[PDB]
């Protein structure tokens, strides 16, 4: 039946993570809930690296419900990588008890974003078609076990104010109208892997510029990815968008904005299923501290994908409450409440 509300912590508007347990008795972890990947993994007790010793580790030998598998697994992310071996155990999210859940026991991890993370691992919520080693994803296993009843969706709220107490929620098996206003706009999934769909256009129309900036001019593809902080796009288009906004880059992976000029920045709008989804500069500028300085990072970054697409990460998924619907293979967006 359910539904199962999973509460999230918001670290600096860049990552969101929540509690799970594995095994019998429960071993507790924090994981990022990631609609851009399909695998669950945690650091192994068989790992004694600096990384593993400063995170929560899974010890199969203390779990009476553990079952061995032992296949090698390797996963590559935009911001890191992981390798280890597969095991299977009970996985709990709130009051949901997900039996026989494959997980990766991580032995080697790379990427600062993972190595210094406040979370222990990643719980993928993408389609099973992209699961490394073909192992059943958590949500798929919930559906197989009938834990959502007849409502095989999950809905994500991300708070974009890190000073606020409640970071966010993943609601398994429901849509909470107390997290949105108006009506949901749905878009059908195209390629089932990521939560991928067609976008009609992307634009910015400044009051201070003679011309608008019209991107994704002939339509484009996008994904909804809770595990991406910003919005990514085809580099050529993101370069131009940042030029229109006054973003500059001579190092790193992001464009920077003058922190004293943010109030003059125009909205940027994504048109999806014929409806406009606007982002104010308050929505798309991320405060970051690096190397002793406060920066204002443009929330539009370039990323070349195998087939060009835009990744709509937390910058978008905060102001728009998002419904991930596996009964109808569609994504819903509504203005957050």
């Amino acid at each position: 039946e359910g539904p199962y509300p999973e509460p999230l912590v918001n670290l600096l508007d860049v990552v969101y993570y929540g509690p799970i347990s594995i095994g019998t008795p429960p071993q507790d972890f924090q994981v990022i809930f990631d609609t851009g990947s399909a695998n669950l993994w945690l650091p192994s007790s068989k790992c004694t690296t600096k990384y593993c010793l400063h995170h929560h580790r899974y010890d199969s030998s203390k779990s009476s419900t553990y079952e061995a598998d032992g296949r090698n697994f390797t996963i590559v992310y935009g911001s890191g990588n992981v390798e280890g071996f597969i095991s299977k155990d009970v996985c709990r999210i709130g009051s949901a008890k997900v039996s026989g859940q494959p997980l990766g026991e991580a032995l080697v991890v790379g990427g600062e974003s993972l190595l210094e993370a406040p979370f222990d691992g990643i719980l993928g919520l993408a389609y099973p078609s992209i699961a490394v080693d073909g192992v059943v994803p958590v949500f798929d296993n919930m559906m197989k076990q009938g834990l959502l009843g007849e409502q095989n969706v999950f809905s994500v709220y991300l708070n974009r104010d890190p000073s606020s107490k409640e970071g966010g929620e993943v609601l398994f098996g429901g849509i909470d109208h107390d997290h949105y206003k108006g009506s949901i706009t749905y878009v059908p999934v195209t390629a089932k892997g990521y939560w991928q769909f067609h976008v009609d256009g992307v634009k910015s129309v400044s009051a201070s510029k003679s011309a608008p900036e019209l991107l994704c001019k002939d339509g484009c593809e996008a994904i909804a990815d809770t595990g991406t902080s910003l919005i990514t796009g085809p580099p050529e288009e993101v370069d131009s968008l940042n030029q229109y906004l006054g973003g500059t880059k001579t190092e790193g992976g992001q464009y920077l904005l003058d922190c004293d000029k943010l109030e003059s920045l125009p909205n940027v709008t994504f048109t999806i299923s014929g409806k406009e989804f606007s982002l104010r500069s308050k929505d798309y500028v991320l405060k970051v501290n690096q190397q002793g300085q406060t920066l204002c990072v443009s929330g539009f970054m370039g990323l070349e994908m195998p087939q060009p697409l835009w990744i709509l990460g937390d910058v978008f998924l905060g102001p728009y409450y998002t419904i991930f619907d596996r009964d109808q293979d569609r994504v819903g967006f509504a203005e957050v409440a």
């Binding site: 851009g36 399909a38 974003s113 990815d225 902080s229 910003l230 970051v288 990323l303």
Partner: peptide, 6 residues
């Protein structure tokens, strides 16, 4: 930030 699987 971060970009989650390729």
């Amino acid at each position: 930030x971060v970009v989650x699987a390729x």
